[PDB]
């Protein structure tokens, strides 16, 4: 079947492990545990369409290249409470579009921790930055599981019409 490789960047602790927890596993997970690479392979259908999504979850402490490579489509993201995390944004997308020889790639660009309410980033800062990439840009919460599968999913349909 169809094989999506999504790969999931950005710094650290921003929640990109419980992003990818909550799409596979359904639950949130509220502890310090700073990931290494993590891989999570599952079979699911979109928009009809049977695949695998093949999920590499990354690490945010400063291997990039040789994942990005391999990768087709990409989840940039940063926390809606961390101004340096959306900053750090631009060197992840340059990262990749290095790696790939591309100006274009798969990617969506995500503001996750929505549901906090000591926000310093506002959304239409990010959304000016992803109409300035041509990506979209979604506003997720790992916590209450809005915007997750949407993130995702976009980001297959992104694939889609790469
Ligand atoms: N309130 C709230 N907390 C969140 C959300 N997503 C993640 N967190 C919290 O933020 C902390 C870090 O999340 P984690 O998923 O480990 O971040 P990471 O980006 O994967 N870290 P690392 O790059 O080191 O691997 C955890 O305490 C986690 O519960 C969210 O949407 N809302
Ligand atoms: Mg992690």
Same mark, same amino acid.
């Given at each position: 079947?169809?094989?999506?490789?999504?790969?999931?960047?950005?710094?650290?602790?921003?929640?990109?492990?419980?992003?990818?927890?909550?799409? *596979?596993?359904?639950?949130?997970?509220?502890?310090?545990? /700073?990931? *290494?690479?993590?891989?999570?392979?599952?079979?699911?259908? *979109?928009?009809?369409?049977?695949?695998?999504?093949? *999920?590499?979850?990354?690490?945010?402490?400063?291997? =990039?290249?040789?994942?990005?490579?391999?990768?087709?489509?990409?989840?940039?993201?940063?926390?809606?409470?961390?101004?340096? %995390?959306?900053?750090? @944004?631009?060197?992840?997308?340059?990262? @990749?579009?290095?790696?790939?020889?591309?100006?274009?790639? /798969?990617?969506?660009?995500?503001?996750?921790?929505?549901?906090?309410?000591?926000?310093?980033?506002?959304?239409?800062?990010?959304?000016?930055?992803?109409? %300035?990439?041509?990506?979209?840009?979604?506003?997720?919460?790992?916590?209450?599981?809005?915007?997750?599968?949407?993130?995702?999913?976009?980001?297959?349909?992104?694939? =889609?019409?790469?």
């Amino acid at each position: 079947m169809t094989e999506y490789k999504l790969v999931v960047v950005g710094a650290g602790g921003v929640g990109k492990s419980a992003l990818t927890i909550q799409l *596979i596993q359904n639950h949130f997970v509220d502890e310090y545990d /700073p990931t *290494i690479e993590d891989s999570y392979r599952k079979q699911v259908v *979109i928009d009809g369409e049977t695949c695998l999504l093949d *999920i590499l979850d990354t690490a945010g402490q400063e291997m =990039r290249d040789q994942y990005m490579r391999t990768g087709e489509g990409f989840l940039c993201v940063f926390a809606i409470n961390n101004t340096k %995390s959306f900053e750090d @944004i631009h060197q992840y997308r340059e990262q @990749i579009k290095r790696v790939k020889d591309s100006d274009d790639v /798969p990617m969506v660009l995500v503001g996750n921790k929505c549901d906090l309410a000591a926000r310093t980033v506002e959304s239409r800062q990010a959304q000016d930055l992803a109409r %300035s990439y041509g990506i979209p840009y979604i506003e997720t919460s790992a916590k209450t599981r809005q915007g997750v599968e949407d993130a995702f999913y976009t980001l297959v349909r992104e694939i =889609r019409q790469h």
